[PDB]
Design a protein around this ligand. Structure first.
Ligand SMILES: NC(=O)c1ccc[n+]([C@@H]2O[C@H](COP(=O)([O-])OP(=O)(O)OC[C@H]3O[C@@H](n4cnc5c(N)ncnc54)[C@H](OP(=O)(O)O)[C@@H]3O)[C@@H](O)[C@H]2O)c1
Ligand SMILES: NC(=O)c1ccc[n+]([C@@H]2O[C@H](COP(=O)([O-])OP(=O)(O)OC[C@H]3O[C@@H](n4cnc5c(N)ncnc54)[C@H](OP(=O)(O)O)[C@@H]3O)[C@@H](O)[C@H]2O)c1
Lengths: 289, 289
C-alpha cells in the first residue's frame, strides 16, 4: 500500500505537501517547530507528532520543507542515529554545494538523501502544472517514486545521482524563463513606440517561443560535439540583426542595453573564429568565467 | 485569376519568391542586375525583363528582394512615372526608418507600398512553415492578398498601416529567440560542470520553453494596463533567484555575466518602486534609454 511519509515543516509549502500525501491515502505524520499548524491536517487524518524524534521515527520517508539549510540542520543534527536506514528528501531551497554537502552528511549518518527543487507554488502541488526535480541515488528515488509522484503526478523527474543537480537545473530553467520574458518585454517596449499593444504582439511572441523550443533540441548535439555548423544563420548574420535591434532601440528612445549585451556575447564568439559557425558556438563564451 | 507579378532580385531568396509565384500560376516577370540567374525560371515561364523600368511596367505588383536598403534605393530612385499605379512590396531587410521613408516616397510617385519581413529560409517559401509579416496601408495588402499569400500560405500576417511595423516585429521576435538560446546555452555550460550532457538538459529546457510561451500571453494584459500584480513571484523573489544563478555560475567557474545582467535589469525595476510587483513591471525600465 501507500508508503508511510513524514513531513517536517508546515509553512505554506510544507502544508501543501502534507495535504497532498494525505489526500492520496498515505499515512502522513507531520511536525512543525511552532505549535498550532497541524490541527487541520490532524483532523483530516494526519498524525500530529509530539517531537521531531517521533516524527522521523514514524516513517522511512522523511520529507523536509523549511526556510533554509540552517533550519534543516537545527531540526536534524540533534538526532542520534534516528536517520539510519531512512530516506531524507530535502525540498528546502538551497544551493548545489549545500545539497552535495548534505548528501555526504546523510551518507555518514546511514541515510539515503535526495535533494529536490519544487517548480510550483503551493496551490499547484498535486496538479499537472507542478514539476519537482530530484537528484541523488537512483535507488532511493525508485523506491519512493510512487509516493513522491503525488506531489507532481505529471512532473516528477529524477536527474541523476549527483545531489547538486536539482538546484542547478532549477536555476537553469528559470534562466530560460527570464530570457523569454525579457525578450517579450523589451519587444513590447520597442513596438509600443509605434502604438502596438502588447496584447497584439503577444500571440506572435508566444508562437515564436514555441518554435524556438525546437531550436533548443536542435542545438544540443552541436553543443555536445563541440561542432557548430551554421545551419540557417551564421553568427555573423545573428550579430548583424542584434546590431539592428540595438540601433532601432536607440533611435526610438527605448533601452538598448539588452541588445547591446547580446551583441557583446556574439562578438566574443566571432573574435574566436566563429563568424561562420551556428549560434551553438556561443556555448564556449558561457563556459569561460 | 492570379495577378501578374514582377520580382526584382534573383538571389537565393528572390529566386525562391519567383519560383513560388510561377508554381502558383502567376504571370511572373523577373529582373536581376547580373544576367544568367533566370534560366530555370524562364524555362518555367518567367518573363525575363531587360531593365528595372521594363520589369516595373510589366506588372502592377512589384516584389523587391535585393541585398539592402542601399540597393533598393539604387533600383527605385531613377524610377518616376514608371511607378504610378504600382504596389511595391519590399522584402529586402532594412530599418523601420527606411520603410517609413520608402512609403512616403512611393506615395508621392503614385505607388502603394508594403514593407515585408520574411521569417523563413528560401526552401520554406510557399510551405506552411513560412511566416511573412507585412506593414503599410491595408488597402494595398487586401488588394494583393491572394498573390502575397502564395509565399506563406499558412503564415501571412498584415500587422498594421505604419510601414515600419514589419522590421520592428521581426527584430522583436528575434529578441525572444536570443533570450531562449542564451538561456539554454548558459544552462548547458552550468550543468556541464556536473557532467550533464546538453542533450540530456535539452528536453527539460524545451519543455520549459513551451510552458513559458503561456507566460507571454499572460503578461500582455499587465503591460497594456500598466498594472503588475505579483502573481507567483514578486520582483524581489525573481532577483534573489537571479543572484543565486550568478553565484552558482561564479562558484562553478562558468560565465556569470548573463545572470548578473538579468539581476541588473530586475534591480532597475525594483529601484522604481517595484519590489512587490510582478515581472511585467520590467517593461517600464525597457522603455527608458
Ligand atoms: N512558492 C513557495 O512557497 C515555494 C516554492 C518553491 C519552494 N519553496 C520552498 O519551500 C521552503 C518552505 O517555504 P514556505 O513557503 O513553506 O515558507 P514559510 O511559509 O515561510 O514556512 C517556513 C517554514 O520553515 C520553518 N522554519 C523556519 N526557521 C526554522 C528553524 N530555525 N527550525 C525549524 N523550522 C524552521 C517554519 O517553521 P515555523 O512555523 O516554526 O516558523 C515553517 O515551517 C522554502 O525553502 C521555500 O523556498 C517555496
Ligand atoms: N535566408 C535568407 O536568404 C533570407 C531570409 C530572410 C530574408 N532575407 C533577405 O532577402 C534579401 C536578399 O537575400 P538573398 O539571400 O536573396 O541574398 P543574395 O543571394 O546575396 O542575393 C542578393 C541579391 O541582391 C542583389 N543586389 C545586391 N546589390 C544590388 C544592387 N546594388 N543593385 C541591384 N541588385 C543588387 C543581387 O544582384 P546580383 O545577382 O546582380 O549580385 C541579388 O539579386 C536580403 O535583404 C536578406 O536579408 C534572406
Amino acid at each position: 500500500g501507500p508508503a508511510a511519509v513524514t513531513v517536517l515543516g508546515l509553512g505554506r509549502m510544507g502544508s501543501a505537501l502534507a495535504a497532498a500525501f494525505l489526500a492520496a491515502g498515505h499515512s502522513t505524520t507531520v511536525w512543525n517547530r511552532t505549535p498550532g499548524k497541524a490541527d487541520e491536517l490532524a483532523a483530516r487524518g494526519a498524525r500530529r507528532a509530539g517531537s521531531v524524534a517521533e516524527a522521523v521515527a514514524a516513517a522511512p520517508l522523511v520529507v523536509v520543507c523549511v526556510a533554509d539549510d540552517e533550519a534543516v540542520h537545527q531540526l536534524l543534527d540533534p538526532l542520534d542515529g534516528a536517520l539510519a536506514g531512512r530516506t531524507l528528501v530535502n525540498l528546502t531551497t538551497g544551493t548545489s554545494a549545500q545539497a552535495r554537502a548534505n548528501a555526504a552528511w546523510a551518507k555518514e549518518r546511514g541515510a539515503a538523501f535526495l535533494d529536490g527543487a519544487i517548480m510550483a507554488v503551493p496551490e499547484d502541488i498535486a496538479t499537472g502544472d507542478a514539476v519537482l526535480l530530484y537528484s541523488g541515488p537512483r535507488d532511493a528515488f525508485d523506491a519512493y517514486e510512487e509516493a513522491l509522484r503525488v506531489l507532481a503526478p505529471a512532473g516528477t523527474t529524477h536527474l541523476g545521482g549527483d545531489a547538486g543537480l536539482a538546484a542547478l537545473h532549477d536555476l537553469a530553467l528559470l534562466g530560460i524563463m527570464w530570457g523569454v520574458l525579457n525578450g517579450f518585454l523589451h519587444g513590447a517596449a520597442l513596438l509600443g513606440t509605434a502604438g502596438v499593444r502588447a496584447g497584439d504582439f503577444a500571440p506572435l511572441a508566444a508562437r515564436m517561443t514555441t518554435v524556438v523550443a525546437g531550436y533548443v533540441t536542435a542545438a544540443a548535439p552541436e553543443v555536445d560535439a563541440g561542432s557548430y555548423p551554421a545551419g540557417d544563420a551564421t553568427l555573423t548574420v545573428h550579430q548583424e540583426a542584434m546590431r539592428h535591434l540595438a540601433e532601432e532601440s536607440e533611435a526610438l528612445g527605448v533601452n538598448a542595453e539588452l541588445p547591446r549585451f547580446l551583441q557583446l556575447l556574439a562578438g566574443r564568439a566571432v573574435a574566436e573564429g566563429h563568424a561562420e559557425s551556428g549560434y551553438s558556438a556561443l556555448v564556449e563564451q558561457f563556459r569561460k568565467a
